[PDB]
Amino acid sequence: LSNKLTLDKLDVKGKRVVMRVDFNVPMKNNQITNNQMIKAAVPSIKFCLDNGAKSVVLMSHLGRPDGVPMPDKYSLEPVAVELKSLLGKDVLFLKDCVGPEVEKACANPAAGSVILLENLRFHVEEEGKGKDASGNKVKAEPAKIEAFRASLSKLGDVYVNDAFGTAHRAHSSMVGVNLPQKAGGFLMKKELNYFAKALESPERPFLAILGGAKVADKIQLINNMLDKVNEMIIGGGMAFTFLKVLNNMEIGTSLFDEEGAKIVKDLMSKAEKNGVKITLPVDFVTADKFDENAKTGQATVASGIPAGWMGLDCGPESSKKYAEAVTRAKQIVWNGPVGVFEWEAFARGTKALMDEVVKATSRGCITIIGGGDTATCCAKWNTEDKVSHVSTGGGASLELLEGKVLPGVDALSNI
Numbered sequence: 001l002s003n004k005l006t007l008d009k010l011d012v013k014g015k016r017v018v019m020r021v022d023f024n025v026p027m028k029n030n031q032i033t034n035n036q037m038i039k040a041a042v043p044s045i046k047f048c049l050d051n052g053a054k055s056v057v058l059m060s061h062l063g064r065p066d067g068v069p070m071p072d073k074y075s076l077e078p079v080a081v082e083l084k085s086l087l088g089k090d091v092l093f094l095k096d097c098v099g100p101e102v103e104k105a106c107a108n109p110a111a112g113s114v115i116l117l118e119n120l121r122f123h124v125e126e127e128g129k130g131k132d133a134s135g136n137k138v139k140a141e142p143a144k145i146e147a148f149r150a151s152l153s154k155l156g157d158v159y160v161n162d163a164f165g166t167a168h169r170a171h172s173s174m175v176g177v178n179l180p181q182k183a184g185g186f187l188m189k190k191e192l193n194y195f196a197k198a199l200e201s202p203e204r205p206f207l208a209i210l211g212g213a214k215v216a217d218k219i220q221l222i223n224n225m226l227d228k229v230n231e232m233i234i235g236g237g238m239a240f241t242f243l244k245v246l247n248n249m250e251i252g253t254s255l256f257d258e259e260g261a262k263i264v265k266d267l268m269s270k271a272e273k274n275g276v277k278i279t280l281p282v283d284f285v286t287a288d289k290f291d292e293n294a295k296t297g298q299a300t301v302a303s304g305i306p307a308g309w310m311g312l313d314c315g316p317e318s319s320k321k322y323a324e325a326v327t328r329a330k331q332i333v334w335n336g337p338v339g340v341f342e343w344e345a346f347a348r349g350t351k352a353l354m355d356e357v358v359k360a361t362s363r364g365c366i367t368i369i370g371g372g373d374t375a376t377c378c379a380k381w382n383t384e385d386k387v388s389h390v391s392t393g394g395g396a397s398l399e400l401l402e403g404k405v406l407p408g409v410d411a412l413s414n415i
């Protein structure tokens with residue numbers, strides 16, 4: 001991860017820059033409800049402009065068109081408008097992202113042109129698959145995927161990828177742009193710096209906080225983290241599988257991963273061999289059903305959860321034990337809330353934990369927040385600036401934590 005060319009080292013003078021960005025912003029009726037994702041890209045674009053780029057060609061996706069043109073539903077046009085404001089400068093919107101018209105527009109544009117192409121996932125060749133009118137799955141054609149990729153490549157002299165949250169997929173805009181320099185943008189650079197350090201040479205003690213719902217789909221996540229951490233909190237729905245298996249806890253109607261249950265002792269076994277201290281919750285906020293407005297109660301590992309009730313958050317004693325581990329940590333990676341954060345009644349455990357993680361940052365702890373749900377919590381409670389790094393990609397950060405090679409990152413130029 002440390003070895004990749006980045007925009008700041010990329011000579012852009014006189015050069016057409018084709019830049020993959022993440023402009024998948026929240027929307028209601030083709031009006032942008034939060035422009036944060038667009039503003040995050042501005043530094044990369046403005047850098048190209050300020051250093052004499054002939055053009056910047058922006059490409060991205062939005063919504064779920066699924067390989068079909070939906071310009072009434074998932075057009076990037078509104079985003080071109082918003083971008084005009086943010087840059088203080090015209091953005092040319094083109095109605096497609098490939099083909100002879102688009103290539104002609106991009107071939108030798110007026111010096112300093114900013115161009116936004118239309119949604120990449122209007123074409124089946126981006127993701128390599130999609131759906132038709134009736135919702136039947138359809139596959140893309142190999143020769144067409146090739147031509148789509150060659151068309152994207154014509155649009156610039158150099159390539160910048162600043163869409164970390166898509167770099168876990170081998171999509172055409174991630175891996176298909178064949179130019180002699182392919183560099184990470186300023187957002188990508190951040191992602192690579194933080195996760196490279198945490199995976200290759202973290203501060204010690206290194207704590208991982210892993211939350212979620214099921215166990216069986218995080219074996220490799222847990223396995224790879226146990227190769228590298230000094231401590232690991234387990235929370236969220238996951239924990240009840242560990243507790244039933246390890247302590248014969250009665251869990252009522254709480255999530256139970258029947259498959260995951262059978263490898264729990266194997267995971268602890270590995271932790272023991274490596275000297276990883278595992279901190280599991282010891283008490284819970286319970287709900288009579290999986291509903292935002294369910295009746296609430298309280299339970300401990302000792303009491304167990306009564307029949308017909310489920311544990312949707314940790315309780316105050318668990319919060320302390322989590323806090324003891326956070327206090328010891330010099331580096332933290334947090335991927336996954338420890339309760340049903342979406343519903344206020346079961347968000348306290350995650351909010352409290354978030355406060356401890358903020359306080360740790362103040363004292364010099366390195367704190368990395370995974371994308372997806374953990375980063376939503378940071379947005380929702382105004383702590384994006386109070387941790388060291390909030391990741392911009394859920395699936396992407398998770399695959400890095402699993403120890404995988406990300407196609408989009410791997411395709412970047414070295415040194």
Ligand SMILES: Nc1ncnc2c1ncn2[C@@H]1O[C@H](COP(=O)(O)OP(=O)(O)O)[C@@H](O)[C@H]1O
Pocket residue numbers: 211212213214215217235236237238255311312313336337338339340341342373
């Ligand atoms: N105790 C719990 N019971 C049920 N769901 C939980 C609990 N704690 C957290 N969650 C939920 O887990 C979800 C995140 O699950 P996810 O990260 O997708 O795990 P998985 O990939 O195993 O489904 C969140 O929507 C959150 O509301």
